[PDB]
Amino acid sequence: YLLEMVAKDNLFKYTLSNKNILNENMKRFILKNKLAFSLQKHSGQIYHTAMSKKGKSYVKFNMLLQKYILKNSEKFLSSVIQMIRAHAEILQIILQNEDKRTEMLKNYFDNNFNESCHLGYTGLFEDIQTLLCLRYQENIQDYQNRNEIIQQNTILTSDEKEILIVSPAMDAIHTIFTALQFIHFINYNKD
Amino acid sequence: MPKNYTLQNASNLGWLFYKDYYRQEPNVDFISTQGKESDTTADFFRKTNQRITAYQLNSESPLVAAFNNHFGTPLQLKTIYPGLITGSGLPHQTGSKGEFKLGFQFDYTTGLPYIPGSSIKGTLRSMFPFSLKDKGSTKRILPEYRKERMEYIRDLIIEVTNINEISDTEIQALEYAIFTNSTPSGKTIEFSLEEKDVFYDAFVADSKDGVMLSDDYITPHGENPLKDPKPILFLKIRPDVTINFYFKLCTTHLYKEKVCSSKQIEEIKKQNDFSSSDYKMITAHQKRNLFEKILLCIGIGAKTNIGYGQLKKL
Amino acid sequence: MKISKKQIEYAIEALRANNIITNDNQYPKVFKGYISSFGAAVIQSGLIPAIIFFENEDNDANADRHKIIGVLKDIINAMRQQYTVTDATILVSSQIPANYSMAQYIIEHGNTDQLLKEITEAAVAMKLALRMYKSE
Amino acid sequence: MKISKKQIEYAIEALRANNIITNDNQYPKVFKGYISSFGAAVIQSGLIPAIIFFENEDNDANADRHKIIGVLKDIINAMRQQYTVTDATILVSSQIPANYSMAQYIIEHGNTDQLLKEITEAAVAMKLALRMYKSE
Amino acid sequence: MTTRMYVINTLSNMHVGSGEVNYGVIANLIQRDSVTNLPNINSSGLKGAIREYFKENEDLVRELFGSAPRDEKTLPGKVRFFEANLLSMPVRSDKVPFLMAISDEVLQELITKMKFFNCEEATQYISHLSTLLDNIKTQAQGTDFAYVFDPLLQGAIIEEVSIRATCPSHIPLQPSLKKLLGDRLVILSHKYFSILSDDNHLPVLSRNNLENGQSANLWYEQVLPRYSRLYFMLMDGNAQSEYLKKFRDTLCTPSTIIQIGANASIGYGYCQISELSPF
Amino acid sequence: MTTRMYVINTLSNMHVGSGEVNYGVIANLIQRDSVTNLPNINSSGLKGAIREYFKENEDLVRELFGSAPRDEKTLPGKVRFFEANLLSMPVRSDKVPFLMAISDEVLQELITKMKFFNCEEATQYISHLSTLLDNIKTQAQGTDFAYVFDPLLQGAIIEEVSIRATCPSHIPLQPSLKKLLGDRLVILSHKYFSILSDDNHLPVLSRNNLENGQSANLWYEQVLPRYSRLYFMLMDGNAQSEYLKKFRDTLCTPSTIIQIGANASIGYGYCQISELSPF
């Protein structure tokens, strides 16, 4: 499922082809070169995201995973993870503010985590900010016109529109959140 | 009850001055305008003021002995005769005649007159260069203020300790360590519990052969020299009264321009790189000497520009 | 201690009634200091000394300083007006006579804690209500 | 009290509107403390005393503390808009007039339960939205 | 060996500031108990102060109080600190400088706490405090009272002209109870004690901030009067005997003074802690 | 014999966290009932605290509470722990230091729970509680009420809700009802109790963390007032009579104190458990 209907964007094509919309205008919005992964921990919690392997977001993601995963010595903060989840709407507003997006992201990550212990994790914060901004830019480039035209479609049911319309900012936030949770899941031992 | 203020037979001075002062007697009026100016009210307040200023304190008083036991050895100074005034701004007046129109600072539990440690801290810091905050209404006064206070504190430091050279940064660090127990630029220093300057409450310790409280007049003649002046009555600490100043002070270590704790200074000394020209020390004895010189220079209390609350050595 | 909105309403009405807030919703600047000084005197010296000091009208002060005592009486009267029958058995619900001296009223009624609590309530209400207005 | 994104956008617009955020995305540092302390003042002193304290313009504050009350009113007014108008709805979707001060509005309109909830949520949105800007 | 009662004798004024915005006269008020509205020290503040005193002994602090806030591992605290409820408050008088004020309800709360917590020497104290309480209630017969246990302190004005002291010559005050509650002890009705211990009657201190000799700010501070007595319970957990003995010996020595509350640099809140002496 | 009612008498201020991010003034909030929104202890917390008290008796906890979280074998617990709902709460008063506040809806809920579960001494308690509630409804006649049952408590004020309690002379308070609901008991309407028990009227305490004398953090904690009373049902499964009897004897011993909630090292949430006394 992850390879077919998520990584290869076969949800979009299949859903449109079932209702016989398809057509060349929508086919040019089909996206490929994507990585999709899910992590089902022993409990039933799924961490599932998809990202483009074209562009700088993938290389920043790989460098972050190389950086903050301990070997067998940059330090990792675990409370940023719950900040991403809880403050997702605020991060969406900050990302959608185009003119001052980087400045607002830095100010938000500085005003939160504004304590003495957080001075040692400035590298993590700025890495997260840059990766999130890159992910949002690639997301908007890949999805904005697609979402706009899907919204205007006159035969699609609201359920299909909702499962097809991908929010550019929340998907980037979720990608960063899942990357951070994968880092924490690798790092933390039950000791 | 009469002289020799003791824990056994004596009324609380603060209670007499603030609570029992304006008590209603069968034939005393100070509500109506006639009552406040009548001589019956004047006699009532005269009797109350006599009761207030009819108390002595012995040298070996158990209260002062307990203070000495609790707060360490005292710094004993004597009162010049303007008198000593503290807590003057407290509200104490009804518009009557013969009453004390000014507030006084009395310890609640003991009733002995005292100077709160905050007053001592502020008076001592007021002659240090960094006692004024930048704010923005201070901007004009700030440069001159720091300059004169730097020169004064520099001469005092060279006087009291065996240091032949100090700097503005060193003076800043010393002042902030002494009063704020921190650094001039915010962040704190890992100080020991002992390494902390505490300013206790100064207490009246000995009224040798007389009472400790007196009554005094300030008569502000108005801006109209052709109108009648206002006699204002208040309560002062008598001259030649031993005031015990209690402090808990430590030794300050200054290496280079920064203040160091004892734990840091031990490692700094043991380092293969060291400079006696950079390591400065102010002993707690020399700190107490500095505070004593400041107190002798400026004094304590209210109306100090008029002279109230100036001291000599005992 | 929490000041009720009803107390603030009574304070506003009393400030307007004893000609403290002008028809332009402004007050003389010295009355804020008057009210702060009254609160400090009440806590430090006592109810009788503070009320006697601020009930004076031969005072050569810059404004009509007895107006705060008048406002105090108005607020206390409004407070006592809304007393319940359950409260009237324990508290003195009688309306303070207008011409009657406030200090004399306190003295003839002892020095009960009820009057002290009412005075403190009304003083804080006066403070807040004055803060609600502009000081020209 | 979960983060309400719409209230966050309202807070952003109101912070820009009441001249708190400069053209460069910075604000006077003291406003952080103002927003943080307003909620505590409301909880442990009462809504009216807290509003009166923060609405005063005769204060010895390092900045214009009364701007936060205007931002609060703007957020509340924005919330009164986009209220589902129906016969069963408790909420009063009547906008607060600009000429009325916030303290008067709660005094004259004596249904504080709606106003208290709206003011608390608006203050939370204020504090959460102030963090997007530099704390100069 | 588990639960112990300690009496806090404050050598100076104490300000354990509550987080409170009072828009009346007193800007800074002190913490009051959530139930009886009497002045108290929150257990967190007491634990912090005592931990600050013992900070030099890393082992003792780690074993008794727990781990530091900034630590990779966190260690649960072993010793339990209970809030310090007010026991005796000095009250100004005319015959004597100050008497130690306790209330019948404060005594009832003390007896109830001793019964519930099972202090070390609780049995005899409970018995004699109870007997004193029934004697006082039998004498009072419902009316308000101010009972002193020295015939010389008769007619004393307990901080208010309304509260006059009388000596009931049937109630004996045992020497150990005098040691616990104070030398010059007056036991008041709850109405009288609540009048004497409310926000309008507690001692207030005036402070201002000067800028180049000119006043910039002005505020009033509420303080707990000097020589006040507060009692708190200490529970020994599974702590080591050696560290516990060192802690108790240091805490209960006459030369140990602990700073509790605010305004440490200006002398506020210096206290002596004394263990409950055998009856 | 299966279902018994246990009353929780808190000796300290209790804080049972809810794990809810408030984003407002009070970061740390206490647990509240799902339906009535009254402060409560989740049965998981009750079970954990009582298990922690009995952790020394490994056999008893294995038999009654079940197997430890890390155990190769799993053994389901036999005793059923029900959530502790607020019964009575201390409210500030003037005549007395505090009153025991209960609402008529809380009494109705207690009657309903005793009817549904059939506690051991349910019949007499239900009868007398229903008679009391019917008398209260007859006296009030649909209005807002505040009724005290000692004639000395007439006119006692509730500080948070500025009302004074009346004395309905027609209604008797049986001594067992006094032992269950608390001494100095006041019964008031649901509106009054809801205002008394909301987030704005519960005791909120300010706390901070100091680093070398500098404040690092600042947060507000709300607590359930000390001397509050809570009731919960205990249903025994096929539990062995020996371990069950030992459990009841140790739980209801006056020497037994159980810590439920957070802030244990600062003495929060220490309680006594007692059974429903025979009527």
- Coil, strand or helix at E205: strand
Please indicate whether, in this complex, the C-beta atoms of D41 and E21 are within 8 angstroms of each other: yes
How far, in Å, CA of C26 to CA of C19, rounded? 11
- Coil, strand or helix at B131: helix
Amino acid at E72: E
E145 touches chain F (CB under 8 A): no
Which H or E run includes B253?
A: strand B252-255
Distance from CA of B94 to the nearest CA of C (A): 4
Search chain F and give the residue with CA nearest A87.
F23
Of residues F227, F6, F230, the one with CA closest to residue F106? F230
**Tokens found for residue B96:** 């009557």
* Residues F34, F40, F41, F43, CA torsion sign: negative
Q: Within 10 A of B290 (CB to CB), how many other CB atoms are there?
A: 21
Please indicate whether, in this complex, the C-beta atoms of C127 and E26 are within 8 angstroms of each other: no
Task: Answer for the pair C15, C71: CB distance below 8 angstroms, yes or no.
Answer: yes
Search chain C and give the residue with CA nearest B15.
C45
- Coil, strand or helix at C51: helix
Task: Answer for the pair A34, A52: CB distance below 8 angstroms, yes or no.
Answer: yes
**Bridge partner list, F164:** F157
Please indicate whether, in this complex, the C-beta atoms of F217 and A115 are within 8 angstroms of each other: yes
* Residues D61, D64, D66, D72, CA torsion sign: negative
Please indicate whether, in this complex, the C-beta atoms of F263 and E44 are within 8 angstroms of each other: yes
DSSP structure class, residue D91: S
- Coil, strand or helix at F129: helix
Sort out which chain D residues have CB atoms less than 8 A from E20's CB and list them.
Answer: 44-45
Please indicate whether, in this complex, the C-beta atoms of D2 and F23 are within 8 angstroms of each other: yes
* Strand boundaries in E73-222, DSSP class E: 80-81, 84-92, 98-103, 146-148, 185-188, 204-211, 214-222
Of residues E164, E49, A99, E105, the one with CA closest to residue D25? A99
Could you tell me if residue C3 is left (phi over 0), alpha (psi between -120 and 50 degrees) or otherwise beta?
Answer: beta
- Coil, strand or helix at F157: strand
F78 touches chain E (CB under 8 A): no
Residues 188-217 of F with CB under 8 A from E: 203, 205-207, 209-211, 213, 216
How far, in Å, CA of D54 to CA of E133, rounded? 50
CA dihedral D68, D72, D74, D76 (to 10 degrees): 180
- Coil, strand or helix at B235: strand
Could you tell me if residue C108 is left (phi over 0), alpha (psi between -120 and 50 degrees) or otherwise beta?
Answer: alpha
Distance from CA of B74 to the nearest CA of F (A): 26
Touch between F and B (at least 3 CB pairs under 8 Å): yes
Sort out which chain C residues have CB atoms less than 8 A from D107's CB and list them.
Answer: 5, 8-9, 12
How far, in Å, CA of B80 to CA of B309, rounded? 7
Task: Answer for the pair B48, E94: CB distance below 8 angstroms, yes or no.
Answer: no
How far, in Å, CA of D42 to CA of D48, rounded? 8
Sort out which chain C residues have CB atoms less than 8 A from B105's CB and list them.
Answer: none
How far, in Å, CA of E133 to CA of E129, rounded? 6
* Phi, psi dihedral angles at A99 (to 5 degrees): -65, -45
Tell me which residue in C39, C111, C117 faces E162 most closely, judged by beta carbons.
C111
Please indicate whether, in this complex, the C-beta atoms of F155 and C86 are within 8 angstroms of each other: yes
- Chains contacting chain C through 3 or more C-beta pairs under 8 A: B, D, E, F
Mutant choice from C1, C2, C5 vs D, greatest count of D C-beta within 10 A: C5
* Phi, psi dihedral angles at F214 (to 5 degrees): -105, 135
Which H or E run includes A37?
A: strand A34-40
Which H or E run includes B114?
A: strand B114-115
* Residues E69, E71, E74, E76, CA torsion sign: negative
Please indicate whether, in this complex, the C-beta atoms of C116 and E200 are within 8 angstroms of each other: yes
* Strand boundaries in F67-119, DSSP class E: 79-81, 84-92, 98-103
Residues 175-204 of B with CB under 8 A from E: 179, 181, 192-193, 196-201
Residue tagged 């707990």 (tokens): E224
**Tokens found for residue E68:** 């530091």
Task: Answer for the pair E61, E51: CB distance below 8 angstroms, yes or no.
Answer: yes
Task: Answer for the pair F83, F45: CB distance below 8 angstroms, yes or no.
Answer: no
Amino acid at D41: A
* Residues E87, E89, E94, E97, CA torsion sign: positive
CA dihedral C132, D1, D3, D6 (to 10 degrees): -60
Strands B114-115 and B202-207: antiparallel
Residues 18-37 of D with CB under 8 A from A: 25
Amino acid at E81: F
How far, in Å, CA of E2 to CA of E237, rounded? 7
> How many Cα neighbours within 13 Å face the side chain of E10?
31
Method for structure elucidation: cryo-EM
Burial (CB count <10 Å: 0-12, 13-18, 19+), residue D103:
buried
Task: Answer for the pair E62, E81: CB distance below 8 angstroms, yes or no.
Answer: no
How far, in Å, CA of E45 to CA of E28, rounded? 17
Please indicate whether, in this complex, the C-beta atoms of F211 and A86 are within 8 angstroms of each other: no
* Residues B102, B107, B113, B119, CA torsion sign: negative
Please indicate whether, in this complex, the C-beta atoms of A115 and F21 are within 8 angstroms of each other: no
As a residue count, chain A comes to: 191
Search chain F and give the residue with CA nearest C113.
F94
How far, in Å, CA of B291 to CA of B297, rounded? 10
Task: Answer for the pair A148, A103: CB distance below 8 angstroms, yes or no.
Answer: no
How close are the terminal C-alpha atoms of chain C, in Å? 30
How large is the C-alpha radius of gyration of chain F? 20
- Chains contacting chain B through 3 or more C-beta pairs under 8 A: C, E, F
Burial (CB count <10 Å: 0-12, 13-18, 19+), residue F150:
middle
Task: Answer for the pair C51, C118: CB distance below 8 angstroms, yes or no.
Answer: no
**Tokens found for residue E274:** 């004394």
Long-range contacts made by residues B296-301, C-beta under 8 angstroms, separation at least 24? B296/B77, B297/B127, B298/B123, B298/B126, B298/B127, B299/B80, B299/B123, B300/B84, B300/B86, B300/B115, B300/B119, B300/B120, B300/B123, B300/B202, B301/B84, B301/B85, B301/B86, B301/B88, B301/B115, B301/B119
How far, in Å, CA of E154 to CA of E95, rounded? 9
Please indicate whether, in this complex, the C-beta atoms of B110 and E226 are within 8 angstroms of each other: yes
Sort out which chain E residues have CB atoms less than 8 A from C106's CB and list them.
Answer: none
Amino acid at D74: D
Amino acid at F169: S
Sort out which chain F residues have CB atoms less than 8 A from C87's CB and list them.
Answer: 155, 164
